[PDB]
Structures are given as structure tokens and as C-alpha cells.
């Protein structure tokens, strides 16, 4: 009978283990996993108030995405008596001077922001690792390869070893991809990436206490008949799109930047044509997968997108390109609408006619989805339901959202219960079907879902991770599940009691998906039993394996001032510098990466680069670099590209273009280097 | 049917039977063949083909009756949609309609 929440036994045990030895906490997603983070933060708050120059310390809450960082900053602010700052790229952190960072740490005891912001902050010596009491990494399973989590952890292998902070890793799932076999190797690799071993609850009392916020939803499968035959209007649309592609290859827009493949082996179309082709291919996919009506909504979405592109286009030829694309989209829309209308002889009642045409003009997947929706929420209270729909493609979200709007305003029983809404990842699609220049609706989809206005969420892998949403009664995985983490984490969205988890699977694919889900359950069991049975006294990986984990890549570069030039930040620093040299809108050109051929490589590097890749880089005409930096002979193209960028950045630093912190020199620094030579007489008058 | 709402049967037409011509606008169409062409893949077949049939009327979905439902209903058109149903094809509760 109290309001304030008390820490439980397992949370206190986790805090006691963490305060003595750093590690990773693996708990199911919920309020348990964040309360332990808050308690750990509170534990290491002894030196918060004392300033850094007086031996003080700070805390670091490093998040994966910006919105998760905002949520965690708000939670730490509203749950603790400290004051927290929010540091992400939207703030314009890039042009912050030394003083604006010094006073910034001086104000805030706890710093919350994305991993890249703190990586740049530390590598530029704005803080030292000795200045932080504790570092908290949430969703720590993302730290593999060259993810900024692992890059930040790499900074621990260079700095002073006796001044290292505590690293605490929060995660609800430990694996990222489908590498579910040999769980022990992956878990050991993750425990070596950080500097601790995994801890999780193992007492039956501890598990039962955990289950007061975590819930195991009941999971079911809804088989539907898959068919391959397709309509004739589909053939006409496909022929039109083929003809349009043939015409578009000769569109003759202005001269465009050269686009090549990921490893520079093969050429590619200009991105402006690639965008059109991508949209039309996506439309063909939606038409094949969900039916004629879904294509009818998709073509309106394409109309809107091409209209926005045409208005935003700057060249006349690009405007003509988008006009031709819009004309083709309009022809397709007219064809689909005619096909839909050539059925209405059945009856005059339009309200049931809409449902009839929707059910007749859709693949069995969509029909079964709509029927399961209808029987799930026949006559219920809109406040009593809160459900998510997970689909794969971005435009599938908008297509299904439009289809659901039309279907909801077609059925007497679902008209006043379901309120559909949708959201997608970065590069947001336009949420309108009318292409109006501006709309007065302002409230975001996720805010509407949180506030109870909407209860039907059509999302694409965006709400699987990070973003805080309330417990959901139903979670419909309309598209087939693909990855272990997606299965485990979307299964965690159905966090309410007796929640329903629904999978839609085709008849021909039932055995495959059943075996895949069985594999995921087995892998979860192996993770649990491996964590339970393993006993280790040292409970922290040693120095030799930690050094061996990071030693594969190119070694970093540090100067006398302490700044670190990470080889994986070399490309970013190079392009960021190249974005500052031009003094016009049309003067921006990126470095030209060229892969050397066999004869040229043999001519330059001799036989010492036989069987290895080398990359030559040509800087733009404005830059001081005009020497065609050559990369070291590397095994593969990606490493050679990194090496060439690293060498170019080192040469730039040697030439004084990087201001001893490995960021491009700004104008104020350039004139400050001259103030004492040309403006020396200013000092007698108290001005500089 | 996709209309899973419950409804009230008013009278049974003993003289009626499947294979009878639809009275209005579908004299060439019978109840049996129309049922097979509309949901025959869902029902398969109809048993007791010579037995009686039923005529049903729909119920309102509303629960608040304090305000007048003023509107242009076109009552003759509203009553125009008379529904004739095959008994074995519709689930029957034992609950009285009145």
C-alpha cells in the first residue's frame, strides 16, 4: 500500500555485483531493466558535485538512437534528483568549442546522448575517461563490428588502465543476427567487447519477481492459402512499367554524379533515376503481394511522392522526369480504378459494397488478416484494445494503413473501435494521400498511440527496439519473421497479461517457419542454461583476450595532446573536411575513390602487393592535397578504402588542416593563428 | 456471410422452397444457385432442398434511444431489401426474438 516503488531483491543483487565488477545485465524488456540502470547510476554518484579540476567525476548514459536517448534522459531526470543533459546531432554539437563543452559538463552531472556524440566528444579530448565515474550502454547487443559502441569500447584499450570507469550494459536480447548456433562463442565475444561477464536472475524467487513486469504472451499461427496466379490488369501494368523503364534509361537529365556499387566494382544509375525505379519496383511488389486494392492505395502514395519530388526538383529536366513519372502513375491509377469499378453490378448498397470489393480484390493473405482483425475486435471498447502490426517494407505500412482506413469505414462493427495509425523509420514517407502543401495536423503517430487516440499501430521494425510504448494486447506479425532478435523483442511488446501474439504464415511455408521458431526457442534455452551453469571466479575477461579482440583492424593514431584519430572515423573526417572547403553552393565535390588495376598496382607497389587490394584517392581541386594518397596493400576493398582515408586524414593533420583535435580547422582558429603576427598592436588598447 | 451480426426471423414460408425464383429483379436467379455462386465454396452443398425457408429482418445496433433519429430514410426503399434465407445455412439460437 504505497506509491513509490522499492527496489526488489534481484535488483539489489545486480547493483551489488555491478558496483564491484563491471558487467552486462540481461533482463527481459520492461521497467526492471531501467530501474537497475537508475540504481547503478545512483550508486556511482559520490563525485558528481565536485568539479573535474578538483577530482570530480561524471556519469554517461550512452544510447543507440536519438529518441531512445531522449526517453532515457527524461526518465533519469524525472526519477532522480540529478540534472541531466541531452547531447545529439540535432543540437549542432559539431561546432561546439572547448569552453561550451567545459561549462556543459560543469552544469550537468549526467550526460545522455547517442554513441557517436560521446565518441567524438572523447576522441577530441573534451573529456577523459578518468573524468567519468560510470558508463551505461543500453541495447548493448548492437556493439559489434564497427558500430560506435565497439569503437567507444576500443578507447578503453588506449587510455590509462587504472582510471577506467565502470561499464554497464543493458540488453533484452544478447544476439543480433541469426548466428544462433554455438551460443557460447557469441556470448564470450560480446563479454570480451565489453569488460565484464553477463549476469541474470537465476533464483526462482528472482524469476517470479521479474515476471511481475515481463510477460510470456501466448503465440499462435494463422495459416492462409498461398496462390500464384495473377490478374490481367497486373500484366498490363507490368508491361507499362517495363516500357517506362526503357524510355527512362534515355531520359537525358543533366550531368549527374557518378554512382558505383559498394565495392566500386560495378557502375550504377544516377540516384535520381534509382529513386524512381525503386518506387515503381516497390509498387509492383505491393501489387503482387496484397492485391489490386492495395495497389490502388500504393499508386496514390506514389502520386504523392512524385508530386513532392517534382515540387522539390530544381532542374527543368528533373521536373520533366517527375512529370512523366506522375503521368504513368496516373494511368496506372485509372486502370486499377476501372478494374475495381467493373464489379459494382452486385448491389447498390455502397457500405457493404466496399467490404465486398475489398475482400474480392485482395490476396488470401489480406483477406485472412482482415478476418482475424474482425473476429479479434468485433464489438469491443476502443479503450480495451491496443495492438501492433509488424510489416516489412516501408510503403507496405502506408498501403495497409489506407486499406484499413477504408475497411474500418466500411464495417458496421469495426467503425467505432479501431483507429489505425502508422509510422516508419528514417527517411519518413509522407503521411498524406492528397499531396497538400501543408496540413494543420501536428500530433505524431507514436504520441497518438501513447495517448490512447489510436489503438491500431502499423509499424515496420521501428517499434521493435528502443521506443517506449505501452503494453499491447495483440501483436500481429503479418509478414514472416526473419531474425532471432526481432522475434524475441516483438514478442516482448505483447507485455500485458494473457496477451496474444499472432503469426501469419503461408501454407507452403508453414514447416519452415515452425522450424525457425523452434530454433529460436532452443537458442533462448541455450542462452539461459549457459548463463546459469557457467561459473567463473574472475568474472571479467583478462587483458590478453581484450587486446586480441581489437588488434585485427588498423591501429589508431594519437598525438601528444591525447586526441585519437580512429581509422573507422577517417572517412567521416575526410568527407566532413571536404564539406567545408567549398565557398559556393555548387562548389561541393567529394573525394574520388579509385581502385587500382593489376598493372598499375604492380607498377607502383611492385610484387609486395600481389594478391592484395589497394585504393587511390584523388582530392578535389580546391584542397591542398593533390598527391593521390595511396592506401596500404590490404586484403579486401573495404579495408583498403579505410586505409586510404586514414592516410589522407593523417596527411591533412600534418599539413595543419586538422586542428590538433582531428576536426577541420574553422575560420576563427585560422585567424587566431595570425592575430599575434598582424594584429599585435591591438593589445595596447585592450582589444583583440 | 461476412455479416456475422445476429438477426430476427419474422415468419417461415412453408409454401416457399429452395430453387424458387427471386420475386424482384432476379426472376432468372434462384435461392439455391445464388447461394452456391455467392458462398458455395464455403458451404459446399445444401441439404433438405425441398423443405421450408425463412424470412428475416435486421436489428438496430444502437443502445441509446433518447434522441429522435430524424432523417430521410425512404421507408419503401428500406423495406425493399427483403431477405429470404435457407434454414440449415443459418445458426439458430433458442432465445426468443421478442
Amino acid at each position: 500500500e504505497d506509491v513509490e516503488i522499492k527496489p526488489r531483491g534481484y535488483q539489489l543483487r545486480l547493483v551489488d555485483h555491478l558496483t564491484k565488477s563491471n558487467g552486462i545485465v540481461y533482463l527481459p524488456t520492461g521497467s526492471g531493466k531501467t530501474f537497475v540502470a537508475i540504481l547503478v547510476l545512483k550508486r556511482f554518484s559520490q563525485d558528481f558535485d565536485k568539479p573535474i579540476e578538483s577530482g570530480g567525476k561524471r556519469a554517461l548514459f550512452m544510447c543507440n538512437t536519438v529518441e531512445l536517448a531522449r526517453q532515457q534522459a527524461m526518465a533519469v531526470r524525472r526519477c532522480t534528483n540529478f540534472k541531466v543533459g541531452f547531447y545529439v546531432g540535432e543540437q549542432g554539437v559539431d561546432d561546439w568549442t572547448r569552453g561550451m563543452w567545459s561549462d556543459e559538463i560543469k552544469k550537468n552531472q549526467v550526460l545522455v546522448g547517442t554513441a557517436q556524440v560521446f565518441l567524438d566528444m572523447v576522441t577530441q579530448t573534451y573529456v577523459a575517461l578518468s573524468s567519468l565515474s560510470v558508463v551505461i550502454i543500453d541495447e548493448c547487443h548492437h556493439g559489434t563490428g564497427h558500430h560506435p559502441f565497439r569503437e567507444f569500447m576500443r578507447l578503453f584499450t588506449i587510455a590509462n588502465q587504472t582510471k577506467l570507469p565502470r561499464v554497464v550494459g543493458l540488453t533484452g536480447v544478447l544476439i543480433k543476427g541469426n548466428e544462433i548456433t554455438n551460443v557460447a562463442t557469441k556470448l564470450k565475444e560480446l563479454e570480451i567487447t565489453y569488460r565484464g561477464n553477463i549476469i541474470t536472475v537465476s533464483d526462482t524467487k528472482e524469476m517470479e519477481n521479474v515476471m511481475l513486469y515481463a510477460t510470456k504472451p501466448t503465440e499462435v499461427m494463422v495459416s492462409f492459402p498461398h496462390q500464384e496466379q495473377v490478374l490481367t490488369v497486373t500484366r498490363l501494368i507490368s508491361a507499362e512499367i517495363e516500357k517506362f523503364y526503357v524510355s527512362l534509361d534515355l531520359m537525358n537529365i543533366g550531368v549527374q554524379p557518378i554512382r558505383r556499387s559498394k565495392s566500386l566494382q560495378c557502375l550504377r544509375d544516377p540516384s535520381k533515376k534509382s529513386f524512381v525505379k525503386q518506387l515503381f519496383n516497390d509498387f509492383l511488389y505491393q501489387m503482387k503481394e496484397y492485391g489490386i486494392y492495395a495497389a490502388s492505395i500504393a499508386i496514390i502514395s506514389l502520386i504523392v511522392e512524385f508530386d513532392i519530388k517534382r515540387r522539390q526538383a530544381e532542374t527543368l529536366s528533373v521536373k520533366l522526369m517527375h512529370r512523366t513519372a506522375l503521368t504513368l502513375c496516373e494511368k496506372i491509377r485509372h486502370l486499377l480504378v476501372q478494374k475495381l469499378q467493373d464489379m459494382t453490378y452486385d448491389d447498390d448498397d455502397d457500405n457493404v459494397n466496399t467490404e465486398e470489393v475489398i475482400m474480392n480484390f485482395s490476396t488470401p493473405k489480406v483477406q485472412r488478416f482482415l478476418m482475424s482483425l474482425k473476429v479479434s475486435f468485433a464489438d469491443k471498447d476502443p479503450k480495451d484494445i491496443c495492438c501492433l502490426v509488424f510489416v516489412e517494407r516501408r510503403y507496405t505500412c502506408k498501403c495497409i494503413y489506407g486499406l484499413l482506413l477504408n475497411y474500418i469505414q466500411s464495417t458496421p462493427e469495426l467503425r467505432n473501435v479501431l483507429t489505425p495509425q502508422f509510422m516508419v523509420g528514417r527517411n519518413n514517407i509522407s503521411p498524406d494521400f492528397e499531396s497538400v502543401l501543408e496540413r494543420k495536423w501536428q500530433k505524431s503517430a507514436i504520441q497518438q498511440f501513447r495517448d490512447g487516440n489510436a489503438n491500431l499501430m502499423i509499424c515496420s521494425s521501428v517499434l521493435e527496439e528502443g521506443i517506449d510504448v505501452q503494453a499491447c494486447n495483440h501483436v500481429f506479425i503479418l509478414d514472416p519473421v526473419k531474425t532471432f532478435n526481432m522475434y524475441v523483442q516483438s514478442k516482448g511488446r505483447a507485455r500485458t497479461t494473457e496477451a496474444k501474439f499472432v503469426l501469419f504464415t503461408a501454407d507452403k511455408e508453414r514447416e519452415k517457419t515452425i522450424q525457425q521458431i523452434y530454433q529460436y526457442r532452443k537458442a533462448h534455452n541455450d542462452i539461459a542454461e549457459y548463463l546459469k551453469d557457467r561459473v567463473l571466479e574472475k568474472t571479467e575477461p583478462e587483458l590478453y583476450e581484450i587486446k586480441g579482440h581489437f588488434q585485427d583492424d588498423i591501429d589508431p593514431f594519437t598525438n601528444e595532446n591525447g586526441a585519437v584519430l580512429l581509422p573507422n572515423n577517417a572517412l567521416a573526417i575526410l568527407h566532413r573536411y571536404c564539406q567545408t572547403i567549398p565557398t559556393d553552393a555548387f562548389g561541393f565535390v567529394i573525394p574520388w575513390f579509385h581502385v587500382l588495376q593489376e598493372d598499375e598496382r604492380d607498377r607502383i607497389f611492385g610484387v609486395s602487393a600481389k594478391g592484395k587490394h589497394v585504393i587511390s584517392i584523388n582530392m578535389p581541386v580546391n584542397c591542398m592535397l593533390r598527391d593521390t594518397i595511396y592506401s596500404d596493400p590490404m586484403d579486401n576493398v573495404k579495408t583498403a578504402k579505410i586505409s586510404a582515408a586514414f592516410k589522407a586524414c593523417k596527411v591533412l593533420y600534418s599539413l595543419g588542416e586538422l586542428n590538433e583535435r582531428f576536426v577541420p580547422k574553422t575560420l576563427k582558429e585560422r585567424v587566431a593563428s595570425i592575430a599575434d603576427v598582424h594584429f599585435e598592436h591591438w593589445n595596447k588598447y585592450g582589444d583583440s | 456471410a461476412n455479416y456475422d451480426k445476429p438477426m430476427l426471423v419474422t415468419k417461415v414460408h412453408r409454401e416457399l422452397t429452395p430453387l424458387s425464383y427471386m420475386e424482384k429483379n432476379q426472376q432468372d436467379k434462384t435461392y439455391y444457385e445464388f447461394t452456391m455462386s455467392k458462398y458455395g465454396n464455403r458451404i459446399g452443398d445444401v441439404v433438405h432442398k425441398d423443405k421450408f425457408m425463412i424470412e428475416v429482418r435486421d436489428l438496430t445496433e444502437q443502445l441509446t434511444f433518447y434522441v429522435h433519429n430524424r432523417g430521410k430514410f425512404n421507408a419503401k426503399s428500406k423495406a425493399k431489401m427483403k431477405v429470404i434465407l435457407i434454414p440449415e445455412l443459418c445458426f439458430n439460437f433458442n432465445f426468443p426474438g421478442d
Partner: peptide, 16 residues
């Protein structure tokens, strides 16, 4: 073909 084949209404949630 001209029509997507209709599905029955007797589907159920098979446990996985």
C-alpha cells in the same frame, strides 16, 4: 482468373 480465390471463415488460431 479475374478473381482472387476466397477463403473460408472457419480458420482458427493454431498454437505454435
Amino acid at each position: 482468373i479475374d478473381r482472387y480465390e476466397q477463403v473460408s471463415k472457419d480458420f482458427e488460431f493454431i498454437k505454435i
